[PDB]
Amino acid sequence: QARELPLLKHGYSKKNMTAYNMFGFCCDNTPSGIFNIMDKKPTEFLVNIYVGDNQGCKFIYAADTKGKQGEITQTGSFTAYLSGRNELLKLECKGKDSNIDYKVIAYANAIEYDRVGNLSYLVESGGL
Ligand SMILES: [Cl-]
C-alpha cells in the first residue's frame, strides 16, 4: 500500500519567526522511475492535501517543469514536480502562533506517498 513521504530537512528562524519542513527524497529512498525537473522526463506527482487548523502556514511546490512555484493553504489538489534536489513540498509557518494540521497524499508512477502531521513555530523552534 502507501509509503510515507519522507521529511528531508527542517529548521526555523527566531528573527523572522518562521519554520519549515521540507518533504522529498534522498539517495536511499528515491524510488525507481522517479525523475526530477533537471531530468528529461520529470515525474508528475498528483497531490491531494487536506487542511484543518491553519494559522500562518502554507505549502510551496514546483507547479511545472520549469520550477515555477505554486502555493496552497487549504484542502485541494494539484500537480507537483520534484526539484533538482528531489524536494516535493516545503511546508512553511510564519508567526509566533502559527500552526497547521494536514494530510498529504501524493501519487507518482503507480505509488502512493502519505504524510499526516502538524507544524507549528512553537514546536519547531524547539522551546517549551
Ligand atoms: Cl535525464
Automatic annotation (TrEMBL):
It comes from the Bacteria. The keyword Membrane applies. Keywords: Membrane, Transmembrane, Transmembrane helix. This is Uncharacterized protein. The chain holds residues 54 to 181 of 181 of the full protein.
